[PDB]
Amino acid sequence: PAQDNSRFVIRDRNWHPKALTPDYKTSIARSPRQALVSIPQSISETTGPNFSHLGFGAHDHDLLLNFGLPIGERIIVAGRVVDQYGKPVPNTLVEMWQANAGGRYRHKNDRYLAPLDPNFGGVGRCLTDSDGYYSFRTIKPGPYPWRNGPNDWRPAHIHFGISGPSIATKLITQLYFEGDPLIPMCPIVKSIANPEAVQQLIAKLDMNNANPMDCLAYRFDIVLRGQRKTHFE
Amino acid sequence: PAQDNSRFVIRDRNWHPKALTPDYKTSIARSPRQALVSIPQSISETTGPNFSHLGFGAHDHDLLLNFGLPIGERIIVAGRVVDQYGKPVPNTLVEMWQANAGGRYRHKNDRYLAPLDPNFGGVGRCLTDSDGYYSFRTIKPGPYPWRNGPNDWRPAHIHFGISGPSIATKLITQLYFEGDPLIPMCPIVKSIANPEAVQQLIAKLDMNNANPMDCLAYRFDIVLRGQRKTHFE
Amino acid sequence: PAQDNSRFVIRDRNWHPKALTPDYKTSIARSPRQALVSIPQSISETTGPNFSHLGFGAHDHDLLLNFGLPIGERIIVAGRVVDQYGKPVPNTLVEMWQANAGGRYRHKNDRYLAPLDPNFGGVGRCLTDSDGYYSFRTIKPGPYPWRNGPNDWRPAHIHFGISGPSIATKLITQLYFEGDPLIPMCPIVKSIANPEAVQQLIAKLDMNNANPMDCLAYRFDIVLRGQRKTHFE
Amino acid sequence: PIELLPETPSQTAGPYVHIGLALEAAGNPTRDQEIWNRLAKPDAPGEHILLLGQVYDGNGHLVRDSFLEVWQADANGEYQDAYNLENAFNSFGRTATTFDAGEWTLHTVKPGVVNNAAGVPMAPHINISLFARGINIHLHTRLYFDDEAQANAKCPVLNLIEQPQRRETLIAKRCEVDGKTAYRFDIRIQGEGETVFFDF
Amino acid sequence: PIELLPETPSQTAGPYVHIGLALEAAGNPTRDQEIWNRLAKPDAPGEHILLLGQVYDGNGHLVRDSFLEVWQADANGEYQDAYNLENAFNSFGRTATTFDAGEWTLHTVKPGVVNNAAGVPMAPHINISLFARGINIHLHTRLYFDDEAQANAKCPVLNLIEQPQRRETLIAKRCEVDGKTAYRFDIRIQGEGETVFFDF
Amino acid sequence: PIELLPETPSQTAGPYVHIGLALEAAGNPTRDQEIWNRLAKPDAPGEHILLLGQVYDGNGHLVRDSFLEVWQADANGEYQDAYNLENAFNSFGRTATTFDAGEWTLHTVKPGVVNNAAGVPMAPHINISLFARGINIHLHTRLYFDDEAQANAKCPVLNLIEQPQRRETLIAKRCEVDGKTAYRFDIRIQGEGETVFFDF
Amino acid sequence: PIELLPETPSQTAGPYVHIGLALEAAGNPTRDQEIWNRLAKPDAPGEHILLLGQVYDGNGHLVRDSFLEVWQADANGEYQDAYNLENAFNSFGRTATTFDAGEWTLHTVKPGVVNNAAGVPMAPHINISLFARGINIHLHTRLYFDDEAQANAKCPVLNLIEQPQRRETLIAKRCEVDGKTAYRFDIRIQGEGETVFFDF
Numbered sequence A, B, C: 001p002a003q004d005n006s007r008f009v010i011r012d013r014n015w016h017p018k019a020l021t022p023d024y025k026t027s028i029a030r031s032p033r034q035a036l037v038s039i040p041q042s043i044s045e046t047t048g049p050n051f052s053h054l055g056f057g058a059h060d061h062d063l064l065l066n067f068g069l070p071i072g073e074r075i076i077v078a079g080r081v082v083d084q085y086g087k088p089v090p091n092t093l094v095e096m097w098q099a100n101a102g103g104r105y106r107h108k109n110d111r112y113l114a115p116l117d118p119n120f121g122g123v124g125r126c127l128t129d130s131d132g133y134y135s136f137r138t139i140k141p142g143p144y145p146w147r148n149g150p151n152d153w154r155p156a157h158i159h160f161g162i163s164g165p166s167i168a169t170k171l172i173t174q175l176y177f178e179g180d181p182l183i184p185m186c187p188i189v190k191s192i193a194n195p196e197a198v199q200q201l202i203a204k205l206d207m208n209n210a211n212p213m214d215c216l217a218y219r220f221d222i223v224l225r226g227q228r229k230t231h232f233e
Numbered sequence D, E, F, G: 001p002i003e004l005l006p007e008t009p010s011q012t013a014g015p016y017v018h019i020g021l022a023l024e025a026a027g028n029p030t031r032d033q034e035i036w037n038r039l040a041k042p043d044a045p046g047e048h049i050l051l052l053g054q055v056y057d058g059n060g061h062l063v064r065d066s067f068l069e070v071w072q073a074d075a076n077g078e079y080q081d082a083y084n085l086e087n088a089f090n091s092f093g094r095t096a097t098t099f100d101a102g103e104w105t106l107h108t109v110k111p112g113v114v115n116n117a118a119g120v121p122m123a124p125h126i127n128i129s130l131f132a133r134g135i136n137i138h139l140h141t142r143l144y145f146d147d148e149a150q151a152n153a154k155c156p157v158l159n160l161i162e163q164p165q166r167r168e169t170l171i172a173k174r175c176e177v178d179g180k181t182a183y184r185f186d187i188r189i190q191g192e193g194e195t196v197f198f199d200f
């Protein structure tokens, strides 16, 4: 069974978006009004699932093949998962979901008029390697209009979920694409008060990883909470 | 018939890209080695065709309907055509062509592995109005690898052709999209020596012209050679 | 009857003061806690009344004669109403109200000790002309103490209401006078987060429009929501 | 991106709004021609109705200094923009709440049906803009009628409100005053039963 | 002071979270192996229970697009980290609320007791992480059982909650479904009866 | 000095110019009305001629993706700017070289004489604009006729070319195709026999 | 975008390249072990051949201080990367042009066929890197054999060269030197018949 042998650096709640960020309308009714209660870390919080034995499909991480070829800009989204200490996070679960090239999601509730792509689902999963490396092959998603302000558009983005070594490190986030002019106009993006924090969500064009005459590449590194051994407890 | 009543501001050949720009490989063998011969303007050069009576189809300018719905980010590309004096250029011919959302061109010679879109042609034409305005409805094109350097990729772009008042004003160019990281790496773009000239080819996101929950918009104004009346000739 | 032919640029709710601005006490209890619901523009929102046939009195816009002469600084308040595109808004209704020279309002509820001026009402209306111009003749209002903080004073100001082409454009605002040291200290003024927005509410002394040996003049231009024609709807 | 000139910023109407927009109310002499609360003249076609209501703040207290503006179609579901006192019907009117009772009244006709931009009919409704001291930027709302359930059910606007319970806040309850057909529409700026406010 | 690399900022899961983490729910084909809501197989040791509940927003309306992750010890109070579909028991699971009823369910066993870092025993509990549209950073809670009042009273965690009344928000109500032991655990994100959320 | 707004910078037409400007050639469905290579209808006044030629790069290799625009006077030496497919004659046309043989063709009438700005007659000529991949800004040239030697000798334009040997690069060679009067006009972009290109 | 460390910039080998890479030619004592022009030992499998050539500058003059490096598969189309003087065959060699005749020689075997990354066979070829004074960064080329016309016609690499005439610059001409099979491969750095040089 798992054991309580680690402590995780406390989360900086001023770095992460706050619960109540009114421009992002839905957040108003779905944010607590009472203060979070702080508790010491125990085995309950310092442990989590290890997905090393999950039975992954051959194209789990290849959105081009996992659902003909999809229509859109072919790209590789790769990066590394490390902790605050700069330590690689091996054998961790990285899941992703996104819209198609037109901003259309393959979900019952999406009624946007852009059409679905018969060859595209939009879900991938990948277990990081010994060095914390992950990579997906997909097509660049399109911006999506949504019912926030009368003319709100989400920047093209990919949803990400990262397990990390425990439930204390588990995180859900969104990757944005370098130079997208929509970024600064997004109320969701803007839920993050610090401009420096926003920068961490921007994947960078990575020509060094691109396959000449095939697909481009984007680099997205993920930093999870630093893990340390307990001391003088 | 046409009348020799106007003169056109002389072209700045240092603003425009030069003929010989080696990084753009094709330019080498296709650029003259002799200096251009300058000639005075005559009726021959100061006149040009008027396309007011060309019989345009109803969706000539609507790439979403003129070829199901295409896959990709739905956008409006609009702007104005003016001369260097800032005078609008009414009833002028504006032609555009581009690749699909995946960067595939519907042309025999395009061997890129990105698939064609059964609902997309990629050609439009529009006659500017009384105020020099034009607009197209299309999908945002994807970057395209090409055989220049071993890992060259054109930024997403739309090809444009503008007739203007005479053959002296006729121009073919390329629209690029605001924020595109590929822009500064492109050897065709870099055919232009002045960074300020490059900016002129970049269309800006135009939230004001967008149709909420439908499509975004980009603004691209075009400036043709200034037209003046002959004097003291 | 009216027809749905226009669309109005979406309002920037981060430019306008928000609902809840606690320093302005009355706003605590009079601001919604639920988010506003965004709705697409229809004929209901894109049309509004035209006051072209309203029967205006000869001194409707002249507070010096519309109620002897009032006591106070004689001034002309003039300007133009344009839309965000810079287009003049002709035949539009401009209404204004203000205190007297002592900061006393001719209203039941006004209990300030400054006396009323037997020759001063404080109400005016003016239909803009074919070029979007309006003008009023009045006396400069005095600052007014109000029950907010223990020593709060409204800077001298004139209240304005502008109809515009539709109910979507209608707006109520306040004009402030160039240099007034009380401006930066006012909580109502401070309801506006952006200092740049504040600047727009400041009327500028206009010596060019003043009547020598008679009265001074202030320039106050108003910008209503940009109006455009629908497209690809 | 492209930026246009910035729209002039809104400011509260203040407590003395009446002096400029509700002369009588302010307790001052009115002018030859005023824009007030009688949209329809006795001889205007359509079902003549009386609208009345109160405005509540977040503590549940009456807002006795409110100013409202209304825009509606005529009985034919037609917008009459050319404002004239001679007109039998005007699509525009203004009203305010008594400093005493804190109630506003408007005299009009039940509006005809109008189509949204997509060609879908909206249930009969009255557009309302609310102004008052403490309100930095006016609040937009719609008044719908309880006796048009069938239509209300299909309104593409009413259907944009996510939670069905919130939709109810927009329905005026029919009654009768002096044997005259009336509808009561109360506004709750904040809190329990808070009225739906729109952005457009 | 010493500053490390800042953690990647969180972002809402969004309304379409299902496509990525709850395939069936999204109404899409699933893959061979999926992490779902069945932590224990019929032959797993311990007392088999059913967990169900609803999620409420500040207006008391159901949150139908919520996504939940659970972490618990087996019946021996042991955390089984090697996730495997072949396992009789998995300490980790996922669930979501129905788009219709908006009720989530989990099939597991009552967790055994675990000690805190100080060696003190914690009352049986299930660690919950709540995700959804409108939630910028996930909410952490704990599910306790009403039939463990003795243990509950001595829980070093439960006891950190200053106000007793708040502690109650964490206790699941024992019931029976198809004569099966069930516990109802409703989450109230905001307002009256607002559930206790933790930071660690 | 005075500086106007700068002219939008030119860019190569690219290899796919055909999709935009020579639909057929791109191997795509054309529109009802296209601007093509038949300036004159059979019933057009003047001497009907066929123009043809190839385009060579600096290595002496054919440029199979060139695009050309022509502007010429009618038989009377008159420029007909009002473009209409119903016209017997249009002063404007477009052509391209075959991906195979790399030869372009134009169907027109021999242009009449036009005077320069100073009142001096120019030899009959066709104004040509060359576009293609590798060409950053289009090349301007003129097609003169070998059977107008008398006129050619006196052209104020042709006479501006310093070196006589270079003037000849501009003269089309009269031939016959299918018993029809044709002129061959080859363009050499660079090198030996490089065609004169103009700036105006 | 992502930027890696920049590669150390190239500089010309200079005229004294020999002192460092071709001791003999420099007219200096050699070391025990030297990398030279004999890739195969008499007892090496495959067809033994002699390769020879001259290097020409843009003026048609011999480049007498050139240095070349070759990389080729063995007779079985296999790359022997473990460099050893004891080997019967080495895939790697070095040669230089004589200050006198300005001709280089290499003793090797005709390379077997190797597939490209997409699994398509490439015609037998020798990879060449040329260095010299006046050459800032070395030039890459390939030597193909004229007696492999069939294979040559199908090479995925040779086919990348747009102009067929340019492909011929890469084909070595079979000859005999002292009744021994030889192939002559002349390199023209610039001008007429300029050899195709690659980037990879």
Ligand SMILES: [Fe+3]
Pocket (backbone or CB within 6 Å): C154, C157, C159, D014, D016
């Ligand atoms: Fe005031």
Ligand SMILES: [Fe+3]
Pocket (backbone or CB within 6 Å): A154, A157, A159, E014, E016
């Ligand atoms: Fe999303």
Ligand SMILES: [Fe+3]
Pocket (backbone or CB within 6 Å): B154, B157, B159, F014, F016
């Ligand atoms: Fe292109």
Ligand SMILES: [Fe+3]
Pocket (backbone or CB within 6 Å): G014, G016
């Ligand atoms: Fe040296």
